[PDB]
Amino acid sequence: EESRNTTVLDTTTTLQSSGFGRAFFGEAFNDLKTLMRRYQLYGQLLLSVTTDKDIDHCMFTFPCLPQGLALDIGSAGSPHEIFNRCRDGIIPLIASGYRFYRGDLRYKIVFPSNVNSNIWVQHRPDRRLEGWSAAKIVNCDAVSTGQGVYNHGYASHIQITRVNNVIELEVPFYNATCYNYLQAFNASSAASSYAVSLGEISVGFQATSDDIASIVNKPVTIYYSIGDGMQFSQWVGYQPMMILDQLPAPVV
Amino acid sequence: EESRNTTVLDTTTTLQSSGFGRAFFGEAFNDLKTLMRRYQLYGQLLLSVTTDKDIDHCMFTFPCLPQGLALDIGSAGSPHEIFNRCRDGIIPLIASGYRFYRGDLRYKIVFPSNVNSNIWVQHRPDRRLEGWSAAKIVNCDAVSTGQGVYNHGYASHIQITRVNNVIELEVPFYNATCYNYLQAFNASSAASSYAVSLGEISVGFQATSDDIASIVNKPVTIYYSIGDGMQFSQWVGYQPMMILDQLPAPVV
Amino acid sequence: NPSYQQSPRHFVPTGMHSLALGTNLVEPLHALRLDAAGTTQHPVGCAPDEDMTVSSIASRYGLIRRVQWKKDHAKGSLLLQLDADPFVEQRIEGTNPISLYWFAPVGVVSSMFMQWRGSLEYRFDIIASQFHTGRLIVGYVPGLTASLQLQMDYMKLKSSSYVVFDLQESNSFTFEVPYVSYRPWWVRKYGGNYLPSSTDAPSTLFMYVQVPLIPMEAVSDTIDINVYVRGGSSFEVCVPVQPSLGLNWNTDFILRNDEEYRAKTGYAPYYAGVWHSFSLVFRWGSASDQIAQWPTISVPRGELAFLRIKDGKQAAVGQPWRTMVVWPSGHGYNIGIPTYERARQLAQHLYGGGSLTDEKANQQGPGKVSNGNPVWEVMRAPL
Amino acid sequence: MDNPNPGPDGEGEVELEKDSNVVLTTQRDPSTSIPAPVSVKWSRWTSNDVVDDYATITSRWYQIAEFVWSKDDPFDKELARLILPRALLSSIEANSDAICDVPNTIPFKVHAYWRGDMEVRVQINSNKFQVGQLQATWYYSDHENLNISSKRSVYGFSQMDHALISASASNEAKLVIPFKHVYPFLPTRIVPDWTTGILDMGALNIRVIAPLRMSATGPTTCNVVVFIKLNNSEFTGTSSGKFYASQIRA
Numbered sequence A, B: 001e002e003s004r005n006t007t008v009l010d011t012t013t014t015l016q017s018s019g020f021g022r023a024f025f026g027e028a029f030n031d032l033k034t035l036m037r038r039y040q041l042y043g044q045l046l047l048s049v050t051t052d053k054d055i056d057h058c059m060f061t062f063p064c065l066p067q068g069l070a071l072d073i074g075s076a077g078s079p080h081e082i083f084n085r086c087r088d089g090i091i092p093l094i095a096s097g098y099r100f101y102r103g104d105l106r107y108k109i110v111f112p113s114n115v116n117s118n119i120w121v122q123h124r125p126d127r128r129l130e131g132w133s134a135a136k137i138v139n140c141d142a143v144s145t146g147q148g149v150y151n152h153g154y155a156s157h158i159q160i161t162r163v164n165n166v167i168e169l170e171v172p173f174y175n176a177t178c179y180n181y182l183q184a185f186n187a188s189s190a191a192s193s194y195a196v197s198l199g200e201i202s203v204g205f206q207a208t209s210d211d212i213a214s215i216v217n218k219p220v221t222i223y224y225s226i227g228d229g230m231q232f233s234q235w236v237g238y239q240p241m242m243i244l245d246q247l248p249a250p251v252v
Numbered sequence C: 001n002p003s004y005q006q007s008p009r010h011f012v013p014t015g016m017h018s019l020a021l022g023t024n025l026v027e028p029l030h031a032l033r034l035d036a037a038g039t040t041q042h043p044v045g046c047a048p049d050e051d052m053t054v055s056s057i058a059s060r061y062g063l064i065r066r067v068q069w070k071k072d073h074a075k076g077s078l079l080l081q082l083d084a085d086p087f088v089e090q091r092i093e094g095t096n097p098i099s100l101y102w103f104a105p106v107g108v109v110s111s112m113f114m115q116w117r118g119s120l121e122y123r124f125d126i127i128a129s130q131f132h133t134g135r136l137i138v139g140y141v142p143g144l145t146a147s148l149q150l151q152m153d154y155m156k157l158k159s160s161s162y163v164v165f166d167l168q169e170s171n172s173f174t175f176e177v178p179y180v181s182y183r184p185w186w187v188r189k190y191g192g193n194y195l196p197s198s199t200d201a202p203s204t205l206f207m208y209v210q211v212p213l214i215p216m217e218a219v220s221d222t223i224d225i226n227v228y229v230r231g232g233s234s235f236e237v238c239v240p241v242q243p244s245l246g247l248n249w250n251t252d253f254i255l256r257n258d259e260e261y262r263a264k265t266g267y268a269p270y271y272a273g274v275w276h277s278f279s280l281v282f283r284w285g286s287a288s289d290q291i292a293q294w295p296t297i298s299v300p301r302g303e304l305a306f307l308r309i310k311d312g313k314q315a316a317v318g319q320p321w322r323t324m325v326v327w328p329s330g331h332g333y334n335i336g337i338p339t340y341e342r343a344r345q346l347a348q349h350l351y352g353g354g355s356l357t358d359e360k361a362n363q364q365g366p367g368k369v370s371n372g373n374p375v376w377e378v379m380r381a382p383l
Numbered sequence D: 001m002d003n004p005n006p007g008p009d010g011e012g013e014v015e016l017e018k019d020s021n022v023v024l025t026t027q028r029d030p031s032t033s034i035p036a037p038v039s040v041k042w043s044r045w046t047s048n049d050v051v052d053d054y055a056t057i058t059s060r061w062y063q064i065a066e067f068v069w070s071k072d073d074p075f076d077k078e079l080a081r082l083i084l085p086r087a088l089l090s091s092i093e094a095n096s097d098a099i100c101d102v103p104n105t106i107p108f109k110v111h112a113y114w115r116g117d118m119e120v121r122v123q124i125n126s127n128k129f130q131v132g133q134l135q136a137t138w139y140y141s142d143h144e145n146l147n148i149s150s151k152r153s154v155y156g157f158s159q160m161d162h163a164l165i166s167a168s169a170s171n172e173a174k175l176v177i178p179f180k181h182v183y184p185f186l187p188t189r190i191v192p193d194w195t196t197g198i199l200d201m202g203a204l205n206i207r208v209i210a211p212l213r214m215s216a217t218g219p220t221t222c223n224v225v226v227f228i229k230l231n232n233s234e235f236t237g238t239s240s241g242k243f244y245a246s247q248i249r250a
Helices: A081-085 A091-097 B080-084 B091-098 C105-109 C342-350 D086-096 D106-110
Strands: A040-046 A060-064 A101-102 A119-123 A155-159 A198-207 A219-224 B007-008 B040-047 B060-066 B100-102 B121-124 B157-158 B169-171 B201-203 B219-224 B242-243 C060-070 C098-101 C116-119 C120-126 C131-141 C161-167 C172-177 C201-208 C210-216 C223-231 C272-273 C280-283 C303-309 C323-328 C334-338 C376-382 D062-068 D078-082 D111-114 D116-126 D131-140 D161-164 D172-177 D202-213 D222-230 D235-238
Touching: A040 A060, A040 A081, B040 B060, B040 B080, B060 C131, B091 C105, B121 B169, B169 B201, C060 C098, C098 C201, C105 C223, C120 C131, C131 C172, C172 C201, C210 D202, C223 D131, C223 D202, C280 C334, C303 C342, C323 C342, D062 D078, D062 D086, D078 D222, D086 D116, D086 D202, D086 D222, D106 D111, D106 D235, D116 D131, D116 D161, D116 D202, D131 D172, D161 D172, D172 D202, D202 D222
Parallel strands: B007 C172
Antiparallel strands: A040 A219, A060 A198, A119 A155, A119 A198, B040 B219, B060 B201, B121 B157, B121 B201, B242 C098, C060 C223, C120 C172, C120 C223, C131 C161, C131 C201, C131 C210, C272 C280, C303 C323, C303 C376, C323 C334, D062 D222, D078 D202, D111 D235, D116 D172, D116 D222, D131 D161, D131 D202
16 A cells, blocks of 8 residues: 555654744645645747737637646747746646646736737637647637637626736636546547636737737736635646756856 | 427436536526626727817717627728627627617727827717617718717716726616617617617717827727616517538638 | 824726626626616516526527428438437528528527536427327437447437337427436537537437328328427526627628738728828828838739729729839838839839839829728739 | 217317407317516506597407418418508408498597507318418517518527417417507507507517428318407597598508
């Protein structure tokens, strides 16, 4: 059995329990659900406009999942230095150790401040996630389907960039499942792909093609926490880890 | 009779009622009045100044009705991609299935952020709606009547664009009717046209002709919900629908 | 004047209230009413007879199928194999380029939602006199994919749930279709205009002919069977998403193929006007640096292209400007130069290796803008 | 149960429906369909004139439509688009005489405005061996809608509540239509703020869901007769009869 304990050959005395730092620091760290609610950087992108965008056209999209995105180090010339150097963060390091999840997510998208244009945000729970490839932030090209535009019935919110350039969200668990998958996802079953991400958030600017030039190559950073309903269910052990301070230094 | 039920040949057992998603998602979706209060895009327009506008001159107008406007796909070269591709939304899809309405509407007009000028908004319940043709957003030309200017006694509000570029409204039921018409409207009777829209909202900028150049071809998007007093009365079945994912893709 | 010296609040601004939330939420507004406590009222004859409610819209039969049941049908002939979802289909045989469709009220009220579950109810009105005798299976196979949709008969149907109806005197019955799936809900069939996330039905409804029709020699050999759909007592839908349906109130649809040419979005209407950094050029506004920008024409190496509008009535009118040469001005965008043959020679100069500043206003006049964003035809010629 | 003993008197029970001096009988039970609950009176809000329902004359039945329904009529087929407060008058003017000649409609000649309910009985006289089915559907304000020209089919009127008239059962269609117009009164004549579309509450329209089916020597035709009662009425605005103009022929 795993956690069996045959003969405890104890040489120790009693050690005074601090209450996971409650006695020293005034706060307990036993519950790992409340450490998961500290906001972690989810994604990081430069706004790259390809074709002439209408007011409806979504600037970028991303599938919304607590597992972390398919990790974008970046191009081999210009790497995103946090996901290159500070690999994976905390929430998929804890969600790496579980199998199922049932709950909500929070996002707090941070926009550039040079832009002024009004920003809409759609949650689209219809969208299936076709594999861990393209489980990432997609700078959208010219519109071919209803994926690429503002849509009607889905839950949206419009942040005014002139008042405050951060929209803060609560993306609900709108799946027809018991719980969703939490590791990396290869999409074996065709309906299994309805059960990975909570939905598919698309952020779009309402600017015309004359104000679209101030938008180009400005950073948009996304955060996430797990929003008080998140319950990771089945214990699955961790995979092989990589130690970060053994990564090579950029030799001059 | 319609809902008669002669011989129910039931093979089923009992299925556990979820409460319209209350058991799974923490919220019921039975009442369709509260889904109607999610804001839907009402209209979408580019500010096109034709003649030299005074401070009084209304920039645009629109008749205010829950049926949805006469749907502007756009010009054959440049279509408005949401009303082209995502046809009609939710509130006239539910209001397509009823005949009369009695209630209020909300608007939440979203202005561009490049402009700074102070914006006035008139509600004009005097205005009759002469047919479904020109039941749409009218970019106003040179002033000939009192339609084209700011007026005194009507209920107005002035949004300061420098504080927040969104004015949020509650357009009351100021008709002399029992309830108003809800399908598309051909204006048979001359007084029937007093009974379609709640009124006729006109939005106008207070800018002179030197600041009018920053206004030109900026988008103004309008929303609407139905505002807690809206009661659609007579059940009328739906018309022929069109399926959206059978619409042709833009072949490269 | 007491001085208030305590520390004040420390908020976050946001520009707008929630668009998504709609139930348990006092939403502040700017009412255009005169009374701040005023609410629209419903007197005794203006009363709402119909509660707007999914379980009252979906609980209404809508005719969905008309079935021709003749005498010469054998003891296994299929009458319908429609799917066991609320999106049962009746297509109109019309001449429109996009086909309209009839739906039951359960289908339209279920098309605005992502998911659905629960029993459906099909009412079969077998329009017959008391002298027609027949008998028909209305069965239900849980879980048929489209490859297993064929190879059916009534004998494979009898292994699943089925209902055998005796047409002798009473000539109407309601088969309440079970909800059997692996999933507590079920994702919508069509979706928005998006070809994935288009999930076929949980199961299929069949209707065969168990015992063939035996009509008397005085009554007709044929019988129509009307098939009505209702959301059952257990039918329910949950997540509100983009409706998969549109109205027929405006069936016009604009195909955006890339073969035709026009100005960029936001730079139309435009008129011929002078500009100091460039002679006339198409301008979308009266202020400086408001030139109408133009897309780059995919001209192959060794050729050239000038322009001619498809409709001269929609063009900008100074003569109505029907010809134009699109070329980079040097400020990062393509200007459209109005011409008087001269467009062909200017395209010979520019695509041949020249410039705008090489040696090789009075026609402005009224400055009429174009009719919106008119479609420009690309005429192509060899260099 | 099931003891058939016909006599010289016939077999079944005959039910009646008596009004002022009109009794019309049906062998069969009606297929009633009531699109709205019964309307409140509403003369308190917009009338100081003397208002009286003429229930001893107005609540009688009156035939306003009769039509042959042959088997030559196809599936999706209108049979009668009756505009019912108009069709009561235009049937009389189709009988080539004035409105004042009929007891049911003399207060339309005098009074200016009308609010009331309408009973409609769409009786059929099909044979027992004929097979087919009508539906009788009431639509509120047909002509104030422009996409009704595409809704007007049997798939669209089956969604709202309606009556079914099977040709086998020789069924009768009771249809209680209360007053729901936008304005709480319908003018009987040309009134200052609307002249076009007078006295138009909506349309009873009678489509075909199944056509008539029979043998080669079967009875081809099938007559349908529509009666209307005007029961919970009230008339206001006593005016001259010379301001009443004739209805549009349609």
